[PDB]
Amino acid sequence: TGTVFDSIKATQPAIPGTSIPKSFELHVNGQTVWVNPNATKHMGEYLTRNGLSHSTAEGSQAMLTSLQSAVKDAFSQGLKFNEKMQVGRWELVFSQRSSDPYPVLKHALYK
Amino acid sequence: PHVNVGTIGHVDHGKTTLTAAITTVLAKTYGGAARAFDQIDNAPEEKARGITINTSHVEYDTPTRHYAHVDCPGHADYVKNMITGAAQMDGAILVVAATDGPMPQTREHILLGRQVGVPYIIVFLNKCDMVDDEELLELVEMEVRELLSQYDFPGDDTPIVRGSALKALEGDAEWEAKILELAGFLDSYIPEPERAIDKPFLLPIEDVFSISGRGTVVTGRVERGIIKVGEEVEIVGIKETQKSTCTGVEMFRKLLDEGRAGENVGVLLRGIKREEIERGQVLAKPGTIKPHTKFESEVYILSKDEGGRHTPFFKGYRPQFYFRTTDVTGTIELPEGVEMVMPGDNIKMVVTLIHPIAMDDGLRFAIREGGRTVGAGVVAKVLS
Amino acid sequence: LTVDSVINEPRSVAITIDGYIPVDIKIIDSKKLPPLYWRGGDGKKNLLELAVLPENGFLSSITLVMIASDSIHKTDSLSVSLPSSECGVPVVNTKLWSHSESDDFSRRFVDDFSLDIEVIISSESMLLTIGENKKVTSWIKCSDNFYLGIDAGRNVVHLYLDKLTPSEVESFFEAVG
């Protein structure tokens, strides 16, 4: 049993140069949130902009851990759908279509 | 037990003959040399990878150790091999022909070997058969020790063998015994190299993050030593050195309580703020690394075919120096009388940087200008 | 902002429309170096990001992530008056990011949220206005299905879309929320 990747179900291959998938079902405290590819686009942008570091796996794991600790704090205050979030150093927006019984996350920014 | 040794000396003084004789004679008197491949093919300061060093190699085996012996064919290859860390060495074998004394090239080579920090050097006098007097041998054996002592080597304690490689590989005894005593000095005088896991802990920072409810985590690969949970670590770099404690170590597959050198890990710190940590910094054992701005070093500038300048640079040169994880622009001071530094020749220079960086003697670095690697160097002496 | 040139590189621009993310246009697949962004609108309810390479002024993707049903206005039909200007991918003077070399994302995102955004949507086409300003200048035409418009004050103001069939505005309205 891993530390963080046990809460992630991968749905697409990894972003070029990282170990985070393009989209995944994140299981935080039982809530299943599917991550839209835009959040992962911005996370890979963060991890690649610093330059290729060749130790991107642990950085990606820590980034996913930070994202989970932010989404649990988003659940702590209640989810504001289609609105920017107030979690410190982050900002997330959610949505829920009728076909999806699980909410979707469309935006992830790490300042 | 695997030990790496190198040869230093003039090309036509018979160092290749010595290597062949050592291999064949130790293969006769002892077992055959093992084919083991224990070492990597490259060096620290990864941006300096791909300089196309020649690095002539041989291997032999003694009853106690297995020796990988390396030598360079030319001056440029030798200086590139010493300045970069390719084919690391725990000891060097100085080869001087007793017929004609040490050369200025050999003097410059052992000066470079001191600057890069070659720990021990033993001397082998070749072609001692082509001289019919023991006193001239005594005087040249004294002057090589004098030279070694001039360049801070223990010239008084340096083992010296008076042999002849050619007659040794021609099957004549009393010379096979001399190169066997050479191998015995390799076994006895050269200590076991310091294992990387036993060195002081040091970790270059590559990326920094903050996890809500958990704290700040740094993600880099550890270069030296071991780090365990609960220990206090000092971060040293651009800002003033700070203290923190490791409240856990995270790895890509499982969470572990100790981080050994060579592993890519994630270190959780205590009390430190994301804004205070940057990339160019390093975690270390408190008091084991110090930040410096000025240092004397020996550098090799890449030639045109190696990807460097097509033109020389001058006193007003201001490049970037890429250390473990970042570049820092620095200003250089050239030796007296040096008006220009062409591409392809090695030179000493005193570099002073714009921000402090944690450094010790022997740390290697790359020299870039616009993101392209243009030279390689190793710090010889830290300054104020 | 500052837009200063156009190019003529023929390459396919793909435009998908998910039921989650309203709109997204990908003119090129950028992997040489990630882009840097300009974010416009109201930061809380109406966010529109624009990406541009750091090496030059070429764009990567401009997409709005969320828009309010009140900040849009559906009308009967287009005012499709279109003076065709030079075609191709525009460029941007990247002086806004004076120090993009610190490698901290904070100094990489310039976003003036003081400017709001309106969307005029119809069963025929959709246009986007920014800044609540009465400025109009030449209209760059990236592809026959996607046009763009600059203002007199050195900035992109109006966006336009063509050849859209309501079968995907169904998903667009499922995503606008």
Residue numbers in the entry:
A (entry chain B): 175 to 285
B (entry chain A): 10 to 393
C (entry chain C): 3 to 179
Can you provide the manuscript's text about this entry?
Contact-dependent growth inhibition is a mechanism of interbacterial competition mediated by delivery of the C-terminal toxin domain of CdiA protein (CdiA–CT) into neighboring bacteria. The CdiA–CT of enterohemorrhagic Escherichia coli EC869 (CdiA–CTEC869) cleaves the 3′-acceptor regions of specific tRNAs in a reaction that requires the translation factors Tu/Ts and GTP. CdiI is an immunity protein that protects cells from self-intoxication by forming a tight CdiA–CT:CdiI complex. Tu:GTP:Ts serves as a reaction scaffold that increases the affinity of CdiA–CTEC869 for substrate tRNAs and induces a structural change of tRNAs for efficient cleavage by CdiA–CTEC869.
To determine the molecular basis of the interaction between CdiA–CT and Tu, we crystallized CdiA–CT:CdiIEC869 in complex with Tu and determined the structure, as the CdiA–CT:CdiIEC869 complex interacts more tightly with Tu than CdiA–CT in vitro. In the structure of CdiA–CT:CdiIEC869 in complex with Tu, the CdiA–CT toxin interacts with domain II of Tu on one side and with CdiI on the other side. The CdiA–CT toxin domain consists of an N-terminal three-stranded anti-parallel β-sheet (β1- β3) and a C-terminal three-stranded anti-parallel β-sheet (β4 - β6). The overall structure of the CdiA–CT toxin domain is topologically homologous to those of other CdiA toxin domains from E. coli 3006 (CdiA–CTEC3006), E. coli NC101 (CdiA–CTNC101) and Klebsiella pneumoniae 342 (CdiA–CTKp342) and adopts the Barnase/EndoU/Colicin/RelE (BECR) fold. Mutations His216 and His281 in CdiA–CT reduced the toxic activity of CdiA–CT in vivo, indicating that they are residues involved in catalysis and suggesting that CdiI inhibits the activity of CdiA–CT through masking the catalytic site of CdiA–CT, thereby preventing the 3′-portion of tRNA from binding to the catalytic pocket of CdiA–CT. In this structure, Tu adopts the GDP-bound open form structure, although no GDP was bound to Tu. α3 of CdiA–CT is sandwiched between the β-barrel of the domain II of Tu and the β-sheet of CdiA–CT. CdiA–CT extensively interacts with the domain II of Tu. Phe218 in Tu stacks with the side chain of Met237 and also interacts with Tyr220, Leu221 and Tyr284 in CdiA–CT through hydrophobic interactions, thereby stabilizing the CdiA–CT:Tu interaction. Glu259 in Tu forms a hydrogen bond with the Nϵ atom of the side chain of Gln235. Superimposition of the Tu:GTP:aa-tRNA structure onto the CdiA–CTEC869:Tu structure suggests that the 3′-portion of tRNA relocates into the CdiA–CTEC869 active site, located on the opposite side to the CdiA–CTEC869 :Tu interface, for tRNA cleavage.
